[PDB]
Amino acid sequence: QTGFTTTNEAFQKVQDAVNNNAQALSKLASELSNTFGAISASIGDIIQRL
Amino acid sequence: LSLFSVNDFTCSQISPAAIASNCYSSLILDYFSYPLSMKSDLSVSSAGP
Numbered sequence: 001q002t003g004f005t006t007t008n009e010a011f012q013k014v015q016d017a018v019n020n021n022a023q024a025l026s027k028l029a030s031e032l033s034n035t036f037g038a039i040s041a042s043i044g045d046i047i048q049r050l
Numbered sequence: 051l052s053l054f055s056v057n058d059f060t061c062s063q064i065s066p067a068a069i070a071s072n073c074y075s076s077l078i079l080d081y082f083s084y085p086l087s088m089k090s091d092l093s094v095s096s097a098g099p
Contacts, residue, residue: 050068 057086062094 004011033042051059061069084092091098 048073050065050072 058089 006012034040036042059066064072088098090096
């Protein structure tokens, strides 16, 4: 009951599993969305470009 | 374009329609006298003197 943080190695594994699912979702979709390249609008010539 | 009759109009990496009507952060232009007889030298692919 007293220590549920650094003392519990198993707790760190649960934190890692939560971190992995969130990190994979954000890196695979959110980071790729918007600037996929160095500069991207998600598609070519969205409005101003012709 | 109206001020000077154009012998040739060529745009590379951009549409001619786009160059007339697009939003660009900055415009840089160079004006110089270039002979009609020598137009081949001023080509990016070619390496004329």
